[PDB]
Amino acid sequence: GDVEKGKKIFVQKCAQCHTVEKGGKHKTGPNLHGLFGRKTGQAPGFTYTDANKNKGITWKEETLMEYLENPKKYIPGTKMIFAGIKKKTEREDLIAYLKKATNE
């Protein structure tokens, strides 16, 4: 989608859990510090539930789409609470922002 709207919209409904624009600790969501290429399923501290811990994926521009669209389906019992995104644009916008969140 856009990258800027991704960031804006993200902060509008994601940052509450994922404040990835400062030294925001892993409270209700891990700070998205790399994401693309950064194999999950193994954090140094808050490594989430078993359900996510058990996954071990490289958070590519495939699995992010799957997750953000249908997170409860992608992972059957995460602590993430996000049943739907918007329609389609937001699914592409958020995932475009994070494609630069890996870099900023």
Ligand code: HEC
């Ligand atoms: C709090 C109720 C949440 C909201 C709102 C959002 N997310 Fe989230 N997310 C949440 C938890 C508890 C977890 C842990 C599971 C895990 O796999 O770490 C996550 C995880 C993610 C991840 C992966 C993190 C990683 O492994 O590096 C992504 C990519 C992610 N969440 C993105 C994301 C976005 C863009 C959100 C707004 C649409 C969003 N999350 C909201 C909890 C919560």
